[PDB]
Design a protein around this ligand. Sequence first.
Ligand SMILES: COc1ccc(C2=N[C@@H](c3ccc(Cl)cc3)[C@@H](c3ccc(Cl)cc3)N2C(=O)N2CCNC(=O)C2)c(OC(C)C)c1
Length: 91
Amino acid sequence: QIPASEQETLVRPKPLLLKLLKSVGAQKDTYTMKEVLFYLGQYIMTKRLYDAAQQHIVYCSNDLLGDLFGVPSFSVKEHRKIYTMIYRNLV
Ligand SMILES: COc1ccc(C2=N[C@@H](c3ccc(Cl)cc3)[C@@H](c3ccc(Cl)cc3)N2C(=O)N2CCNC(=O)C2)c(OC(C)C)c1
């Protein structure tokens, strides 16, 4: 859904997103978008923001992730919409 060139572009998270990434072991100030998604995925799995019965929805209410994305839940199927929510959180 997302072109490879766009996934491989270097970006600079704002500090709140950076906090999130660091919490699951990220160590740098800049990442490709593909790396940002890897660490966000790790964060969702670590904090169990998944739902066993309807796995395609992430539940992020009362979590830093929901404050950054501006939503209490989102569909994992919507890659462009997820990219947009992440771009809001970059310098
Ligand atoms: C039918 O149910 C599905 C279908 C697809 C996905 C999914 N899809 C993957 C994905 C989704 C969006 C993008 Cl832009 C890239 C990769 C990845 C993922 C990565 C980052 C985020 Cl923010 C959310 C999910 N993701 C996953 O499958 N993940 C999350 C990361 N680590 C995992 O072990 C599994 C899914 O994830 C939930 C279990 C959270 C459930």
